[PDB]
């Protein structure tokens, strides 16, 4: 009958179902939350 309140010709996507895309980015890693390694951190690790 309906999906997420949508009826008829409906095209659902990731954000429509509160989902992430294939090419999606996360929050960068900080001192309190885990995440992607920053460019500066990678450069510092490579230089060390």
Partner 1 sequence: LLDAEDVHAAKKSHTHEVATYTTDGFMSSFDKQKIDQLVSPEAGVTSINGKTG
In the region spanning residues 1 to 48, those forming contacts with partner 1, defined by CB under 8 A, are 1-3, 6-12
- Structural tokens at position 42: 């990678």
Among 24, 33, 29, smallest CA distance to 45 is for: 29
Distance CA 14, CA 21 (A): 6
Consult the annotation and say whether 24 binds a ligand: yes
Q: How far is the CB of 43 from partner 1 (least distance, A)?
A: 43
Consult the annotation and say whether 14 binds a ligand: no
- Where do we find the tokens 């510092």? 44
Footprint of partner 1 on this chain (CB under 8 A)?
A: 1-3, 6-12
User: Residue positions in the annotated binding site for Fe(3+)?
Assistant: 24, 26
């Amino acid at each position: 009958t309906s999906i997420n309140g949508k009826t008829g010709i409906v095209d659902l996507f990731a954000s429509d179902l509160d989902a992430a895309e294939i090419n999606h980015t996360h929050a960068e890693a900080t001192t309190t939350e885990s995440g992607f390694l920053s460019i500066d951190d990678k450069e510092k690790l490579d230089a060390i």
